[PDB]
Amino acid sequence: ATIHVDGKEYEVNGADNLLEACLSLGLDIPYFCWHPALGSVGACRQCAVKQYQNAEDTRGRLVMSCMTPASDGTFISIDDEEAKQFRESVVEWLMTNHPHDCPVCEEGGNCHLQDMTVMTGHSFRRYRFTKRTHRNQDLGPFISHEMNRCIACYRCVRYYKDYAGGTDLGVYGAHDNVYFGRPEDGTLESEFSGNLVEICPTGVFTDKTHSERYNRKWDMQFAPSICQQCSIGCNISPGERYGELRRIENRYNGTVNHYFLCDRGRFGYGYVNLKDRPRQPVQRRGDDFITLNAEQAMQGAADILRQSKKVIGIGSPRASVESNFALRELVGEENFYTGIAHGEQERLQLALKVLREGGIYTPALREIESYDAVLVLGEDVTQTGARVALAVRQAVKGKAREMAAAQKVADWQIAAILNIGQRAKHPLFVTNVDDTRLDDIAAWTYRAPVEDQ
């Protein structure tokens, strides 16, 4: 397509809405309720631009860029004065009831609301009345709840319910006493509830494990890493401070795990911070445990290994490729053993032979969401490969997406898609020894022994 933003011509995809098209080009439009993975609902009214009917139009009309298609020959203005004033007004309206909490808020320096308050250029408070308050809930060990900071943008419920398929987080109440959370105090039951700490643009849902040993984002030392907790390989950004691993943030990978982790990967990093970890080489001498440095340990181990007639190596599927290879080089190829059982290795080798010799394309984790029918045999995915279960949920919602696409409804207009696709879904057939967490969306569930499956 062709759009004209502030007198400049850009080529954008016509299937996109105006907000994501302009954000792709590098234009800054404030937004709260829109998310790339969740679609457009037009709640927060923050993404306002001025759309003109043609080139020689002067009045224009304030539209929401997330709800407006990026059609061919579309004339808009982002930096128009009326659009800027409306966006600043929306920020001010969000600020009327917002608590004075930024120093004692875990999202400070990481807050989308802070960034959009600064970006709209709103810094002068002329509201003088009382701010509405709220009582918090206990959401369990992982997610801290602070409902005062909510801007009522519906990202949490849209993610947790429409995307993640959870059932225990909704919106309750009315006019401006809208409340987001569980119907009662209790742990959030989703396996993907931890993505709320990044879906929520404020400090309502925060990482409680990060909150117990807290530091700001500018103080973190980050690195790109791979989650070590299961086999899916979601990209993570672990951040440390003062020598201890403080937080696991999601690291975007458009091929694998785009915006979302699972709760095991996000909250199961605390083994790195244990105080019983080995920190120096330790050699036993009778009942004593002498601490060595690096070179003494290497010389002593080399002497004893040189005296021994045959040294064998036992690797692990926890260790990296380089470490298993280094052990294999140390002990020899014939003396290297994968440190897993024979039946486990047989199943792993058969899975490998199927993947790289079966002639059938094995999809990436994001590519799973584009399949029209899913048969899951034996694998309780939600407890072993949880991100695949989330991707399977998206692939199941693909039927509602297809039905809405038949009626010329845009793919980002998610509310109309869910309205058209009421309960129709693509087929899902799961088999397990018992009930899975995918049974709420499965077309059929087969509870049977592994022989019967």
359 binds, among ligand FES, ligand SF4, other proteins, none (CB under 5 to 8 A by kind): other proteins
Residues 93-122 that bind other proteins (CB under 8 A): 95, 98-105, 108-115, 117-119, 121-122
Q: Which of residues 292-331 bind ligand SF4 (CB under 6 A)?
A: none
Specify the stretch interacting with other proteins by CB under 8 A; choose among 47-55, 161-169, 380-388, 403-411. Answer: 380-388
Q: Which of 89, 106, 99 is nearest to 46 (CA)?
A: 89
When binding is defined by CB under 8 A, the residue of 6, 329, 372, 435 that contacts other proteins is 435
- Could you say which of 7, 254, 278, 286 contacts other proteins (CB under 8 A)? 254
Find the helix or strand (DSSP H, E) in which 236 lies.
strand 235-241
Binding characters for ligand FES, 53-92, by CB under 6 A (x = yes): -----------x-x--------------------------
Q: What is the rounded radius of gyration, in angstroms, for the C-alpha atoms of the chain?
A: 27
List C-alpha distances in Å: 272 to 57, 210, 247, 248, 293.
61, 14, 11, 12, 21
- CA dist., res. 162 & res. 35, Å (int): 13
Cα dihedral 307, 313, 314, 315 sign: positive
The number of CA neighbours under 13 Å toward the Cβ of 216 is: 10
* By CB under 6 A, residue 200 contacts ligand FES: no
Residue 382 within binding range of other proteins, rule CB under 8 A: yes
Stretch that binds ligand FES, among 31-39, 197-205, 221-229, 371-379 (CB under 6 A): 31-39
Rounded to a whole number of angstroms, the minimum distance from the CB of residue 402 to ligand SF4 is 27
> Using CB under 8 A, which of 1, 230, 297, 418 touches other proteins?
230
Helix (H) or strand (E) holding 322: helix 321-331
Dist. CA 218–CA 111, nearest whole Å: 12
Q: Figure out which of the listed residues 6, 24, 329, 444 binds other proteins, where binding follows CB under 8 A.
A: 24
At residue 375's C-alpha, the angle toward residues 374 and 380, to 5°, is 105
- The rounded distance, in Å, linking the Cα atoms of 216 and 158 is 28
267 is a contact residue toward ligand FES (CB under 6 A): no
Interatomic CA distance for residues 241 and 213, integer angstroms: 9
**Residue 27 contacts ligand FES per CB under 6 A:** no
Alpha carbon distance 331, 345 (integer Å): 20
Residue selected from 64, 67, 90, 153 as contacting ligand SF4 according to rule CB under 6 A = 153
Strand partners, 9: 4
For residue 83, give both structure tokens: 């659009």
Cβ atoms 207, 193 nearer than 8 A: no
Scan residues 172-191 and list those touching ligand SF4 (CB under 6 A): 180
What does 360 interact with, of other proteins, ligand FES, ligand SF4, none (CB < 5 to 8 A by kind)? other proteins
According to CB under 8 A, which one of 287, 295, 334, 451 is a site residue for other proteins? 451
Evaluated on CA atoms 219, 221, 227, 229, the torsion sign reads negative
Question: Which residue's CB is nearer to ligand SF4, number 30 or number 313?
Answer: 30
In whole angstroms, the minimum distance from the beta carbon of 102 to ligand FES comes to 22
> 261 or 404: whose CB is closer to ligand SF4?
261
In the numeric block, which tokens belong to residue 204?
């309502």
Contacted by 156, from ligand SF4, other proteins, ligand FES, none: CB < 5 to 8 Å by type:
ligand SF4
Site for ligand SF4 in 237-276 (CB under 6 A): 257, 261-262, 264-265
Residue 274 within binding range of other proteins, rule CB under 8 A: yes
Cβ(63)–Cβ(43) under 8 Å? no
* Closest C-alpha to 68, from 403, 416, 410: 410
For other proteins, the binding residues in 316-355 under the rule CB under 8 A are 318, 321, 325, 341, 343-344, 353-355
Beta-carbon contacts of residue 419 (< 8 Å; ≥ 6 apart): none
Q: Does 98 bind ligand SF4 (CB under 6 A)?
A: yes
- For ligand SF4, the binding residues (CB under 6 A) are 98-99, 101-103, 105, 107-108, 111, 113-114, 149-156, 180, 199-204, 227, 229-230, 232-234, 257, 261-262, 264-265, 386-387
